[PDB]
Design a protein around this nucleic acid. Structure first.
Lengths: 131, 164, 88, 195, 84, 136
RNA sequence: GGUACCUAACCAGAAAGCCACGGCUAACUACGUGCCAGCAGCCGCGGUAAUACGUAGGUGGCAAGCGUUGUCCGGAAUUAUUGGGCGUAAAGGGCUCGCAGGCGGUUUCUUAAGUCUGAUGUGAAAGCCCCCGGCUCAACCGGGGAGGGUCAUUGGAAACU
RNA sequence: AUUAGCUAGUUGGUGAGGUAACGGCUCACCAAGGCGACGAUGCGUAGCCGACCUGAGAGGGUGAUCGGCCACACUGGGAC
């Protein structure tokens, strides 16, 4: 069943971070690979690689702790749930914790972060907040 | 991280409360005084104390608040971002404001924030009206915050590409 | 039918007028088509503003200006170059 | 109004004086030797509101109107509010030193003539536009109040220029931060008017 | 020049029992102003068929016109698909 | 609740009731209806005046003037001032106010009405209770 | 309409009241009355020492006004998408089978209905707001912009539904 | 919804009559055609809109003076 897999990706990341685990394994769609490499580029995670298998393919993600005890990725949130979709124009595109936290928004070309989506002046599916 | 006592603090009391206890000969009566203590440079603590005399409860509460202090982020005399202090069925939503609005807050929360020395914060109390629960909620909220440069060094980036 | 006439607004003692194009059936302050210029009889400086191309277009398609708009159009020469356009 | 009861209630004189602070630190009734209780937060906010509006002598509706005008204006609210109420013309006459008190400055503006770009001015928020030479004409020269005002010497403000022999004053670009808040603790007025 | 075109829709036949007309439901649909969810409301029209060349359940293109009857405004353009 | 439950069921707002029911209904002669006017004050002819005690263990004898309004709703109102000069067959104006101590009384009698003479020896709170200034 | 204004000749003289003062809520003292007379928006006050009732003085708020009533919006995150909950506080249908309805695992091409973004025409004028001018700023009166659009035609993008 | 059936020119066509016109707006043939749970029918209430009041905002109430559209002139009907 499991409706959307984006919620399971975000809450698997949140559960492993809140128990302070070291890595995770996710069923690895292309949107999972895209969100994971956005997180790798933004530094919220330490590493990501995907192993191929006939099952679905499995992507494993390695969390980040610079100092010995902290949580770098301080929270995750799904906004564009099924059953209530949400969209943004190019001028009300959101900055949550202004300058400090990122949003994952799939516009008409690529799936992009908030600051570069503003630099491109395009909007789309506002799907994730990383706090 | 414990803070030393080599600071000047203003120890403005917020609330005392008449507190009872029942025994065989009737009622014994004490006063529970809670105060908020902190300098204007960004350190805040609260204190509670029970005594049979009101200034005795005051000195006990200020000694407890000197024992327990915590430091808040004060970059640009206004908090870096929006936050919700959540503890104990009081929900204080804290939101930064532009530099001329002044502090907009309910009573105990305005006492804590004015004693911190913030200039412009809009806050709303979305929970209960119990003063100790508001104090613990707003101190958990002020503890939750973090530096922009702290976010920069934990993400491995610099402040200019955090801001843009 | 269509006329270029005045429309009154402003305070009680001090009026102000808009030179406007509307049919004669419409009331004084009521339904109009478009506005061409203002008029201020109170102020001692003369030569209140008229846009003077759309009024020219309205005179081209035909309209009946009132006396005061007629002689101010004569005063700064709108209907004179209208007459030159008619005669050539 | 008796005009000393306000000073001995609020603890600050109208301009600061050697009078109305000695032997009377309290206004009300038989309640002098009793201990002055500390006020609530609403008490401090209302006392600051009354302090600024009784320093400048203006009604509550005009206080609210210029508060909304100042906050609607760009800049910052509380100090922009004190900028506009500094630029109010009764205070302009008092800073120019044509009067002893703000009440007598109000009287002189109301019935006496001040020729600044027009014969009579009664309405308060008018400003002298710099760059033109307009002065109070010869009808009010040999008057006791103006003679007393020119023979007394006070601290001339740096944001007003003023001449002695032709007795006229003119503005500067803006009133300044150093003289903006000399004894007043601001950001309690905006906190009072938020509620 | 070229005259202005009229509105053209496409939909499903739901009844051809009555003569020289077909009824076309249209599944274009609207959203709440206050919650913002994409909810389907089905509105049906009346059309005018000349040779009865339509069956119940066929995707049909229709174009609005002057009133041909009481509650009859539209016209057949084409029968783009046919049912089983 | 889920968004689809909100879509097909809505959110029914809470319904509030006014604390002065008889002041919100008018009446006319030849149409025989109780249509609403939301009147702030109403006049009426007093048909019974007489006193009894409140329901709380505190006790005092209060005036309890019963009156029929123009729209025909007989209600009991309260006489505030120190003493009164009201009597049966007197036209008297009424405002709405809650008397907590008495039960079943929801209106006050305004003083300075068409017949209500104001109380004497009042120099504080004098715009209420219908008393003019004694000396200029 | 000899109306505002301008010149003038003499008098501080003809021109201030309303409400509150236990807590919320800024501002208190004496005298009468003693579950009586009365107050009250809630807590409640008064059965001989009443800051809660009426006076007298004083203070406090506002000002040609000031209070009460009536109606509506807030504070009410107290019908909660923004912004609530359901073990014991009000709140899980006694449980199942299922129509319509509401949601949908991964990959690859395809259309652009939803989605996002240009162009044009429109959403009249007065209104709110932004910037200037006039009646002794003023209330107001004007001059130029911003929109209150799931609006109609058309071009572009294909990540998501 | 503590209003589940409504429609007895209403249903569409053929023609024939038709206010400036399109049209059951009227006469001859077939259908219970058409409309309904996405609320038809019925009961109650109401002129509507630019706007106004409140609210930080989403949103909640009001339709006065100014402006646009509509309806009525004691209550009905009628035509010149």
């Amino acid at each position: 069943v499991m409706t959307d897999p984006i919620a399971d990706m975000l809450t698997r990341i949140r559960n492993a971070n809140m128990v302070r685990h070291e890595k995770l394994e996710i069923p690895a769609s292309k949107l999972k690979r895209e969100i994971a490499e956005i997180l790798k580029r933004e530094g919220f995670i330490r590493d990501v690689e995907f192993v191929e298998d006939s099952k679905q393919g499995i992507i494993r993600v390695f969390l980040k702790y610079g100092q010995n005890n902290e949580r770098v990725i301080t929270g995750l949130k799904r906004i564009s749930k099924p059953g209530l979709r949400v969209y943004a124009k190019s001028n009300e595109v959101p900055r949550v914790l202004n300058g400090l936290g990122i949003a994952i928004i799939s516009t008409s070309q690529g799936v992009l972060t908030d600051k570069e989506a503003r630099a491109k002046q395009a909007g789309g599916e506002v799907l994730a907040y990383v706090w | 991280r414990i803070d030393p006592s080599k600071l000047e603090l203003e120890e403005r009391l917020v609330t005392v409360n008449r507190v009872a206890k029942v025994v065989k000969g009737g009622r014994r009566f004490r006063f529970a005084a809670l105060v908020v203590v902190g300098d204007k440079n960004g350190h805040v603590g609260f204190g509670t104390g029970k005594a049979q005399e009101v200034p005795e409860a005051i000195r006990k509460a200020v000694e407890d608040a000197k024992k327990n202090l915590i430091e808040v982020p004060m970059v640009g005399t206004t908090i870096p971002h929006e936050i919700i202090g959540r503890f104990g069925a009081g929900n204080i939503l804290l939101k930064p404001a532009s530099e001329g609005t002044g502090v907009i807050a309910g009573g105990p929360v305005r006492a804590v924030l004015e004693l911190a020395g913030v200039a412009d914060i809009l806050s709303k109390s979305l929970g209960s009206n119990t003063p100790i629960n508001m104090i613990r909620a707003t101190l958990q909220g002020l503890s939750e915050l973090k530096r922009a440069e702290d976010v920069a060094k934990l993400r491995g980036k610099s402040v200019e590409e955090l801001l843009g | 039918a269509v006329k270029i006439r005045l429309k009154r607004m402003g305070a009680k003692k001090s009026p102000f007028y808009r030179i406007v194009v509307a049919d004669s059936r419409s009331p004084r302050d009521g339904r109009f088509i478009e506005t061409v210029g203002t008029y201020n009889p109170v102020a001692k400086p003369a030569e209140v503003k008229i846009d003077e191309e759309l009024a020219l277009k309205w005179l081209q398609t035909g309209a009946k200006p009132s006396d005061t708009v007629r002689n101010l159009f004569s005063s700064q020469g709108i209907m004179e170059k209208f007459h030159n356009a008619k005669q050539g | 109004g008796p005009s000393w009861k306000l000073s001995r209630r609020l603890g600050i004189s109208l301009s600061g004086t050697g009078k109305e602070l000695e032997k009377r630190p309290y206004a009300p009734g038989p309640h002098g030797p009793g201990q002055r209780k500390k006020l609530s937060e609403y008490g401090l906010q209302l006392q600051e509101k009354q302090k600024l509006r009784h320093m400048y002598g203006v009604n509550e509706r005009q206080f609210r109107t210029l508060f909304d005008k100042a906050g609607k204006l760009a800049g910052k609210h509380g100090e922009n509010f004190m900028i506009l109420l500094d630029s109010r013309l009764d205070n302009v006459v008092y800073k120019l030193g044509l009067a002893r008190t703000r009440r007598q400055a109000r009287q002189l503006v109301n019935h006496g003539h001040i020729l600044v770009d027009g014969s009579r001015v009664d309405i308060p928020s008018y400003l002298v536009k710099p760059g033109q030479t307009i002065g109070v004409r010869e009808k009010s020269r040999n008057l006791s109040i103006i003679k007393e005002s020119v023979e007394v010497n006070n601290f001339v403000p740096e944001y007003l220029t003023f001449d002695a022999e032709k007795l006229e004053g003119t503005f500067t670009r803006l009133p300044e931060r150093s003289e903006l808040a000399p004894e007043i603790n601001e950001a309690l007025i905006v906190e009072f008017y938020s509620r | 020049s070229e005259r202005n075109q009229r509105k053209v829709y496409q939909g499903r036949v739901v009844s051809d029992k009555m003569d020289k007309t077909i009824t076309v439901v249209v599944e274009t649909y609207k959203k709440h102003t206050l919650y913002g969810k994409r909810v389907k409301y089905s509105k049906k029209f009346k059309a005018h068929d000349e040779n009865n060349q339509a069956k119940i359940g066929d995707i049909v293109k229709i174009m609005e016109t002057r009133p041909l009857s009481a509650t009859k405004r539209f016209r057949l353009v084409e029968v783009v698909e046919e049912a089983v | 609740p889920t968004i689809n439950q909100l879509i097909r069921k809505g959110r029914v707002s809470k319904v509030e009731n006014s604390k002065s029911p008889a002041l919100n209904k008018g009446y006319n002669s030849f149409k025989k209806e109780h249509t609403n006017v939301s009147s702030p004050q109403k006049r009426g002819v007093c048909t019974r005046v007489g006193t009894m005690t409140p329901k709380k263990p505190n006790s005092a004898l209060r005036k309890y003037a019963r009156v029929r309004l123009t729209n025909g709703i007989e209600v009991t109102a309260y006489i505030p001032g120190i003493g009164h000069n009201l009597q049966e067959h007197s036209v008297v104006l009424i405002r709405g106010g809650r008397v907590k101590d008495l039960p079943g009384v929801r209106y006050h009698i305004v003083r300075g009405a068409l017949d209500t003479a104001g109380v004497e020896n009042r120099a504080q709170g004098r715009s209420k209770y219908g008393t003019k200034k004694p000396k200029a």
